[PDB]
């Protein structure tokens, strides 16, 4: 009886692990993409600040 219960539990665990592999893959890739987007956005903002500051300095 314990073997049958363990077999059912292990089938469920195998299914849920095959699902969780994809779930974690997607989660980590979303995190990496978010990091990339944040880096690009802050780089653009820093460049905007650079150009604005240089505008002010040139005007002075």
């Amino acid at each position: 009886e314990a073997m049958l219960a363990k077999t059912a539990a292990d089938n469920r665990k195998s299914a849920e692990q095959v699902a969780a592999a994809q779930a974690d893959y997607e989660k980590e890739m979303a995190e990496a993409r978010a990091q990339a987007s944040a880096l690009r956005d802050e780089a653009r903002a820093a460049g905007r600040s650079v150009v604005d500051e240089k505008r002010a300095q040139a005007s002075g």
Partner: protein, 50 residues
């Protein structure tokens, strides 16, 4: 002695009946149970492998 022969061959008839009609069904039931437990075992092994 005569009654011994009579009961001996009557028991022979009984054994013939048992082997003809009772042994096949019980053997099939034993085969089914053995195959079911062998399945359960193989299914457990394959679930562990999965």
């Amino acid at each position: 002695m005569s009654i011994f022969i009579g009961q001996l061959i009557g028991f022979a008839v009984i054994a013939f009946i048992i082997v003809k009609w009772v042994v096949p069904p019980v053997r099939t039931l034993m085969r089914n149970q053995q195959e079911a437990v062998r399945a359960a075992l193989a299914e457990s092994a394959e679930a562990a492998k999965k």
